Amino acid sequence: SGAIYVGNYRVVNRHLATHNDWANLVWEDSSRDLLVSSTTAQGCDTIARCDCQTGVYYCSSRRKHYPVSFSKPSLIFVEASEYYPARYQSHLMLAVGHSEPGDCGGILRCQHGVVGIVSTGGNGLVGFADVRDLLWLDE
Ligand SMILES: CN(C(=O)[C@H]1CCNC1)c1ccccc1
Ligand SMILES: [Zn+2]
Numbered sequence: 001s002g003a004i005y006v007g008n009y010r011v012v013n014r015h016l017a018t019h020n021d022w023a024n025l026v027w028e029d030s031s032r033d034l035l036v037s038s039t040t041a042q043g044c045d046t047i048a049r050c051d052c053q054t055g056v057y058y059c060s061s062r063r064k065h066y067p068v069s070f071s072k073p074s075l076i077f078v079e080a081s082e083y084y085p086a087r088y089q090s091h092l093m094l095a096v097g098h099s100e101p102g103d104c105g106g107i108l109r110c111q112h113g114v115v116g117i118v119s120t121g122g123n124g125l126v127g128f129a130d131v132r133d134l135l136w137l138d139e
Contacts, residue, residue, distance in 0.1 A: 002058070002105025004114050005043025006137045009036050013104045013119060013129070015083035031090040033119040033129050036137070046113035048132050055110040057118060057128065061100045068095035070108070070115075073130040078120050089120065091130045099126035 004011035012021055014028050017035040024038040048055075053072065056065045076092040079085065093108075099121025106118035108128045120127030131137065 001060070001102065002107060002117060004045050004047070004107065004117065004131060004137075005039065005041075006045045006047055006114075007042055007139070008039050009043065009137050010039050011036050011117065011131055011134075011137070013117060015081070016104055027134075029090075030084075031088070032092075033089060034091075034131070034134075036134075047134070047137050048110050048112035048115045049135070050110060050112040050115075050132065052110035052112065052115060055108050055115050057095070057097070057108040057126065058106040059098050059103050059118075059126075060106055061103050062098055066097050068097050068108075068126070070095040070128060073133070076120075076127065078127065080122060089127065089129075091133065092119065093128045093130055094125045095128070096124060097126040098124070 014035040021037040026036040028035040070093040116128040119129040
């Protein structure tokens with residue numbers, strides 16, 4: 001689990017979004033595994049505006065942050081799940097690292113802020129849904 005809180009927005013994995021998320025839906029992309037919901041409290045997270053390919057992500061299944069190199073956001077084939085067990089996920093970044101289902105929502109961050117959230121795992125690769133293109137999150 002985990003979310004990004006920036007201004008009056010909550011960013012979550014679309015597959016973990018709650019009733020309240022969908023009740024206050026701002027934007028969702030099933031191809032990206034992202035949902036943004038509206039919040040009453042003003043969030044204080046900073047979204048990275050950059051093309052960093054290095055950062056640190058939180059891995060709940062190890063209670064540890066890992067520094068990683070990650071690929072630029074791309075259209076990536078993803079398998080096995082129950083929300084979508086096989087399809088192309090867009091705006092996805094991979095790194096070599098540990099991820100399990102429950103690690104989804106872990107934040108990946110660089111010096112410039114939040115890069116994205118853990119979205120996919122399997123074969124020792126961790127997929128992060130990029131948020132850096134969502135310039136609207138900051139206004
Ligand atoms: C196992 N796996 C793949 O098969 C991808 C890797 C690049 N193209 C196919 C995958 C997908 C998403 C996240 C982590 C791993
Ligand atoms: Zn950066």
